[PDB]
Amino acid sequence: SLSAHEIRELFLSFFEKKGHTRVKSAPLVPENDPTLLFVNAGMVPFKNVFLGLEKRPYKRATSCQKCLRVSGKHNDLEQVGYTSRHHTFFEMLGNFSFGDYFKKEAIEYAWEFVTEVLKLPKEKLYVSVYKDDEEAYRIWNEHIGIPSERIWRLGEEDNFWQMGDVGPCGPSSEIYVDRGEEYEGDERYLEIWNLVFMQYNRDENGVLTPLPHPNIDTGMGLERIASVLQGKNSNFEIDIIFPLIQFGEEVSGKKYGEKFETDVALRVIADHLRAITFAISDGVIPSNEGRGYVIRRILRRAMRFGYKLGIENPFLYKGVDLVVDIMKEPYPELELSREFVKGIVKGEEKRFIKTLKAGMEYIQEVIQKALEEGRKTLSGKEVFTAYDTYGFPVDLIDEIAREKGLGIDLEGFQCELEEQRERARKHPVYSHLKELGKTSAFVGAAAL
């Protein structure tokens, strides 16, 4: 029923066929973009080209991009593990137009690949349009032949894309597949492709102007679409990620499908193995600031859940070899960094397990001391201690405390943060005062 690897090739080849130029995936860390620590979408590297600043030999491009949404206005690390759709790392299959073909062509190639390449039924397919997108609806309903009953006219928060506050923007059309009456909602009508029509110029004023040369930018998550073709009810059960779940089962001696909590840890470990492998492979080294901290919190999270499963010895390092052997066909460079990634990961692990263990005992203790004493949160001191003494990331402490119904004293943490500061300066990272509380969720205690 089509393997992940197959779908990726079919997409790329299909578009080269449509004159698009296969563009190698940019690395996860933007070369000269101290702005974004991680490429989140296929378009990111083409940004300046859609802007018209940068030049490209071609007007049509297609690619499968290495993506990371553990960050910013596109940061799902928080949900990772709890749902069957969220990930840190993922692949975006996309086709782009640089002032060349637009709406119709965008819609035709999309409709042909879904119906004639992926082989999905034209009857279980739905498309959404910008409510006042007369052009889009018309082409969907008249040119393609989509029965009006299968087309939804939605608002701005649903089909109006924007690059930023001021910026090229425009309508978007999403193709959804109806997976059956045994499902419902955004799970039954699973969106698998979002086509973006950059038609307007949003002045600073918020005033929109047509673009002289409109552009096309599409995005289809690979795992999600593979899950549809392979008849799965989760992205973690697809050919390219299920073995990672199994990885967890074997090392834990626990099984997948028995209890939520366990499935949560298993999914966390699997999603984070891919994230850390592709991240370190692309140059990111664990540390306490920026990218290094993003990955460090990731590896930190996997370790903690792995221990939650009862795993007492380093293990994430063994998963690395699995990730590489699985994604080596589309990402051969991984075999060259396989042994380097494995070492960095084992170093972190061997370099972090014991502290996480003692930290977990400490944290649990105070939690239990809290709910026994009627407390409904962890003190600023209790947070700082596990943050500064056991090295726990601010978010990791919150998640742990969260499982018990307890939260953490946000203001008291901040107060404690200043104290240490005024303390350290009496008795690189660069924070603002009263923003120490915010920064800290992004750096290590040693950093502040």
Buried b (16+ CB within 10 A) or exposed e, 400-416: bbeeeebebbeebbbeb
The one-character DSSP state at 285 is -
Element counts in the chain: helices (H) and strands (E): 16, 13
Rounded CA-CA distance 283/26 in Å is 13
Rounded CA-CA distance 363/292 in Å is 25
| CB neighbours of residue 394 within 10 Å | 23
Residue partners of 365: CB distance under 8 A and separation at least 6:
none
Angle at 145 between CA 140 and CA 150, to 5 degrees: 70
Contact 239, 246 (CB under 8 A): no
Handedness of CA 423, 425, 429, 430 (dihedral sign): positive
Helix axes 334-350, 260-281, angle to 10 degrees: 120
Rounded CA-CA distance 198/210 in Å is 9
Contact 22, 63 (CB under 8 A): yes
Give the phi and the psi of residue 293 in degrees, each rounded to 5.
-80, -30
Rounded CA-CA distance 173/154 in Å is 10
Going from the N-terminus, what domains does the chain have, and what CATH number goes with each?
1-233 (3.30.930.10), 234-448 (no CATH)
In DSSP terms, 218 is beta-bridged to 195
| CB neighbours of residue 319 within 10 Å | 25
Give the phi and the psi of residue 51 in degrees, each rounded to 5.
-75, -30
> What Rg value do the Cα atoms of the chain yield, rounded?
24
Buried b (16+ CB within 10 A) or exposed e, 60-82: bbbbbbbbbbbbeeeebbeebbe
Q: What is the resolution of this structure in A?
A: 2.2
Amino acid at 264: V
The encoded tokens of residue 48 equal 């300046």
Buried b (16+ CB within 10 A) or exposed e, 35-45: eebbbbbbbbb
Rounded CA-CA distance 139/128 in Å is 12
In Å, how far are 105, 150, 205, 338 from 165, measured between CA atoms?
Answer: 28, 32, 10, 41
Rounded CA-CA distance 151/323 in Å is 39
Q: What is the 3-state secondary structure of 104-163?
A: HHHHHHHHHHHHHCCCCCCCCEEEEEECCCHHHHHHHHHHHCCCHHHEEEECHHHHEEEC
The encoded tokens of residue 83 equal 């749902």
Angle at 89 between CA 86 and CA 95, to 5 degrees: 95
Choose among 226, 41, 195: nearest CA to 112: 195
Contact 371, 404 (CB under 8 A): yes
Rounded CA-CA distance 88/77 in Å is 6
Pairing of strands 60-68, 21-22: parallel
Contact 27, 283 (CB under 8 A): yes
The one-character DSSP state at 2 is -
Give the phi and the psi of residue 319 in degrees, each rounded to 5.
-70, -30
Amino acid at 312: E
In DSSP terms, 190 is beta-bridged to 177
Angle at 219 between CA 215 and CA 225, to 5 degrees: 155
Rounded CA-CA distance 218/207 in Å is 24
Rounded CA-CA distance 416/411 in Å is 9
